[PDB]
Amino acid sequence: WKHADPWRVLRIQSEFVAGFDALHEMPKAVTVFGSARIKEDHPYYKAGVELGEKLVAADYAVVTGGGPGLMEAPNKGASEANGLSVGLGIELPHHLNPYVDLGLNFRYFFARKTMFLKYSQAFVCLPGGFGTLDELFEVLCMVQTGKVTNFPIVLIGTEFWAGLVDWIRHRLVEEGMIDEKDVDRMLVTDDLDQAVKFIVDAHAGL
Amino acid sequence: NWKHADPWRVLRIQSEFVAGFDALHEMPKAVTVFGSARIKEDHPYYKAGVELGEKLVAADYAVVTGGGPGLMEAPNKGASEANGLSVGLGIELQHLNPYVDLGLNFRYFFARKTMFLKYSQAFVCLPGGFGTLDELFEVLCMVQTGKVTNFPIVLIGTEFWAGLVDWIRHRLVEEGMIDEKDVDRMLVTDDLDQAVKFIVDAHAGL
Amino acid sequence: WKHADPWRVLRIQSEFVAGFDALHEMPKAVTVFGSARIKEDHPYYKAGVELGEKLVAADYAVVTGGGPGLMEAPNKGASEANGLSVGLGIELPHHLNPYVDLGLNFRYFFARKTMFLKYSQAFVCLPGGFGTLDELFEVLCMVQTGKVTNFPIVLIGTEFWAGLVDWIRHRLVEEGMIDEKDVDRMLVTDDLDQAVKFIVDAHAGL
Amino acid sequence: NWKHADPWRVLRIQSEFVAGFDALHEMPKAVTVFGSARIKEDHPYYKAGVELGEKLVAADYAVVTGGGPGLMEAPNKGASEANGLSVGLGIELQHLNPYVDLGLNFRYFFARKTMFLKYSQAFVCLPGGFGTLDELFEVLCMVQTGKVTNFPIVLIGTEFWAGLVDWIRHRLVEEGMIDEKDVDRMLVTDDLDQAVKFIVDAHAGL
Amino acid sequence: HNWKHADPWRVLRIQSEFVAGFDALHEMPKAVTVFGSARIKEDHPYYKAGVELGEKLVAADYAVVTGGGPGLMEAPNKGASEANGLSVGLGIELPHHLNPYVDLGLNFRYFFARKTMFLKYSQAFVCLPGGFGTLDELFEVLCMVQTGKVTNFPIVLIGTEFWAGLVDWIRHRLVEEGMIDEKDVDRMLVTDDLDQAVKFIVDAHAGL
Amino acid sequence: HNWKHADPWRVLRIQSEFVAGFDALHEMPKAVTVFGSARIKEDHPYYKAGVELGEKLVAADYAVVTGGGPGLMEAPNKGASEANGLSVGLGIELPHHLNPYVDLGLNFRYFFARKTMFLKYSQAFVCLPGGFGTLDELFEVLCMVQTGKVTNFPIVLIGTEFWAGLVDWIRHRLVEEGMIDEKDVDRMLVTDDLDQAVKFIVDAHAGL
Ligand SMILES: [Cl-]
Ligand SMILES: [Cl-]
Ligand SMILES: [Cl-]
Ligand SMILES: [Cl-]
Ligand SMILES: [Cl-]
Ligand SMILES: [Cl-]
Ligand SMILES: [Cl-]
Ligand SMILES: [Cl-]
Ligand SMILES: [Cl-]
Ligand SMILES: [Cl-]
């Protein structure tokens, strides 16, 4: 019965109840994603740290998936600036980083994803792999369909993201897969103050 | 406003899992096919999705789509007209295309997505926008992390997908954000029988 | 809605699902209770430690409420003998001891109590206060009513328990509140080998 | 044997909480009264429980019991015959005594117990066996830990309870397992108006 | 609360135990009762002595009757049973069965009924070392011998070193203060020699 | 995919922008277009120069037309508006509004339509320091002056130090290699004196 569907449905539920209950009081927040593999002496990591700090300076909780690399970097920045640093972890066949103040673990991928969208009001993507891209395209869809509103999307690293963005222009816009505004609405930058200000300005007057 | 609050959200989520697990319980082996909703029937990508549907049914697979128009309908048409099993898992936003034999409509994005991974053993991406991309990188990340196994990923459209693949293959691999096998494992092709035999072979002996 | 009954019922459920799921694989076990206030240099604590070790030597997991004092003592004994030491903690207006290997935290008192009874097959009470006595009388009731069977109850500390046992004889038996066997079935001892053997012997042939 | 397995246990537990929260939703202020089920109507303890029921209703309380015979029936009779609100929360093991105006039957011990703490603001213990003792030390421990507040505890029967109180007061206090106020706070008396006024006073100004 | 927990039923239960005991033991052949500590284990010298005693009693054609429990009650039951003699156990029901060497077992709720059966259906008492349960039967038989309620009822203590201090106190204090007469104590044999014990019994029963 | 994303609709949209622009600006009084970097902030000396330029242009009875964005487009709009002159902004629609000092604003999707409106409805160009958008308009007006498609159309660069290296290259390299004639470059004024700039324009427009 443990692996059968009746228990499963109950377990799924149980995980949604737990998540919603533990995050119910969350203040305004930004979710930051990026590669788990990048090390602490890398420029992207330094930026992630600086991004953490500046978001807290703008009164935002920082939410990440709680792993190492470019999840750690923004948690570290936020925590050491004495803001609220949240890590929403996932059980993988593959542990929360030491800079997560409010740590949650999720068994179900789909429950954890829902949390990011329900308890933050913008996404910033530092450079990453498939996990980062999975989140980026999900939120681009949610914005495009109106399931979330006033939800800024920012990409950090111009060198890094250029190829993807060019392809989405050069091919998806050109072929009518998306509207121009679906890609245009994203900010792509190397400037963290402008990244934060872009978020503040889109959230001004709620 | 109980209708927008958590207790009701939880019951609705449960209701959706239950309805999908019940309806999909008996599913034989299957392939999920993704692609842009906006492409019309006289387009070559559409004609290709009809023929893919047909060949998948000739290989004894059920064909699963998101249930909408365009390149979700094409494979449902192919599969349907070949007298195999055609499935559409819609999202509430419009109705299921008229070539769905087994239809379900989901309100929750994340619930629908789960059902693709649970009730099919391969993903084929026809050209598409952000909804297709979102599904592609979700599966790439499930394969990468071992959460699914023997789960082939095919992209149809060499010209369309080239530039994405080139960015992945050069940005992500070179910066060390994925391993080279993580991208090489997927098939990129315009040859539909080669796509099907790719899938068959990866499922050999189950 | 958070403090209202619909969410509450869902939360209650969620906690039962989580507990049953995490303890489902438990091997045979004994629950040990006792005072949280007793210190590590006290005779009762030494006995609790020795009790831990001997239960593991008889192939039993040791389950406690995970707090300090005479919960810690049996966890320590069991853990340092490389057996399975379980701590089932409770959120109080009042943290698991360092010798808990499998630690769970419960919001609901009634869910945590159910766990002790469902995932152990005997109770041993070291000397304690009201929390210990609450558990002792609950299990005495469950045995008396047949809700659990082959469930040995042992009290440790002859000097300590004498007054209570004498009163339950001198008054509850004499007045017909309970049958003689309801108190007689308990072993009261200072001898830990005999405490363990009493449990082994009552569990022999399942 | 789905009927003894966890999925069904969970649904049954939920069903029981829901049914109790629904039926008890509107409860005015109340006292729970405990005592042995085996004492008959011509006994003085029974006569005392009838008069206690009556006086509780004269003080504008509903009277809550476990719903069975003996010293659970006596207060239901007193309360009932004085035209106040008489409640019985039975346990499945037999039926509710005939003086219950508002009856519910529970299969789960732990669910029933919760409802006493949630839907009454004082416990009175007539002489009883292990079921009474179990409830008494549960409330003692809730009061001690701050989980309930302004929650008076009265024991009726000075002769009957003396020896328990003397053991507590000397063993537990002297060995440092409880503080002296933890036992002094309860009232032990044969005077029923003194018992009621004890409760009224502890609830003064709500 | 219950009829069962009140004097009318208690009197019926009492009667029941006398009846069942008198009925089951009525036909007993000649017999010795052996008492001693329930706590001693099978590897202790006393245990081994108890086994040999049961064996020798049966070679003298006696049934061997005990309290039917463990330790130095089981030992003489073992001895007797394994020599193909009659081994009897009259147990007392206690919180937390008869030992496996008892071949005619009865079980008593009432200590006082059980104690009557030892005096009525055996004709000698032998006390291996023991505690308060043993000392209880000893002083009862001694008072039954002194009052004449039993006649020709030899009493033997085994373990000279174990018993010496009790027997010295009884002589130096009870005799000297006139609480007993000297023959009330001189008539017990105290010895370590089991053949002498059994011979004391045989000889005491002979010429009757 | 959409009618909207195809050439028939594009041609209609193009026509629409010319029509709306020709319609709205048809009545314009005499005007100068000012260009310069969108990136400079309001505390920079160039910004302050831009404000003063707008003020002085309006005192010479010119409307002041800009690209309607921030930085050194907003500065002359501010100058002009706050002197009670006509301040015009012809914006280009870009990912991520007209500046708040624009009092006659239009917004263009098509860069090429917008660039036509600057040439058709102003009679002088002044370029504050700027980047590639600025240099683009400069070399277009210069080519329109050299080809005779506009006449009596003065061109002024502000910031002698900023512009010197461009103007030196144009003389030492384009003239010397015969790519332009020397008057094609000598006819621009380069200066830091805003009254001289405005006087160069006035004088160039006089006696016509
Ligand atoms: Cl798509
Ligand atoms: Cl193709
Ligand atoms: Cl009771
Ligand atoms: Cl009383
Ligand atoms: Cl003894
Ligand atoms: Cl000896
Ligand atoms: Cl001798
Ligand atoms: Cl520019
Ligand atoms: Cl200047
Ligand atoms: Cl000058």
Numbering used by the authors:
A (entry chain A), C (entry chain A): 42 to 135, 138 to 249
B (entry chain B), D (entry chain B): 41 to 133, 137 to 249
E (entry chain C), F (entry chain C): 40 to 135, 138 to 249
What does the literature reporting this entry say, word for word?
In cytokinin biosynthesis, the Lonely Guy (LOG) protein has been recently identified as a phosphoribohydrolase that finally releases cytokinins. LOG proteins produce active cytokinins via dephosphoribosylation, directly hydrolyzing the bond between N6-substituted bases and ribose 5′-monophosphates in conjugated forms. Based on the biochemical and in vivo cytokinin production experiments, we propose that Cg1261 is a novel type of LOG and belongs to type II LOGs (CgLOGII). Comparative analysis of 123 LOG-like proteins also suggested that LOG proteins could be divided into two different types, dimeric type I LOGs and hexameric type II LOGs.
To investigate the function of Cg1261, we determined its crystal structure at a resolution of 1.95 Å and revealed its hexameric oligomerization involving the extended N-terminal region. The asymmetric unit contained three molecules (Molecules I, II, and III), and the crystal volume per unit of protein mass was approximately 1.91 Å3·Da−1, which corresponds to a solvent content of approximately 35.76%. Interestingly, the electron density maps of the N-terminal region (Met1–His39) were invisible in all three molecules, indicating that this region is highly disordered (hereinafter referred to as disordered N-terminal region, DNR). The Cg1261 monomer forms a Rossmann α/β structure and is composed of eight α-helices and seven parallel β-strands. Molecules I and II form a dimeric structure, which is similar to the dimeric structure of CgLOG. The hexameric structure was formed by oligomerization of three dimeric structures, and the overall shape of the hexamer looked like a trillium flower, in which each petal was made up of a twisted dimer. The α1 helices of six monomers mainly contribute to hexamerization of Cg1261. Compared with CgLOG, Cg1261 contained an extended N-terminal region, which formed an α1 helix (Asp46–Leu64). Two catalytic residues, Arg155 and Glu178, are located near the covalent bond between adenine-N9 and ribose-C1, which is hydrolyzed by the enzyme.
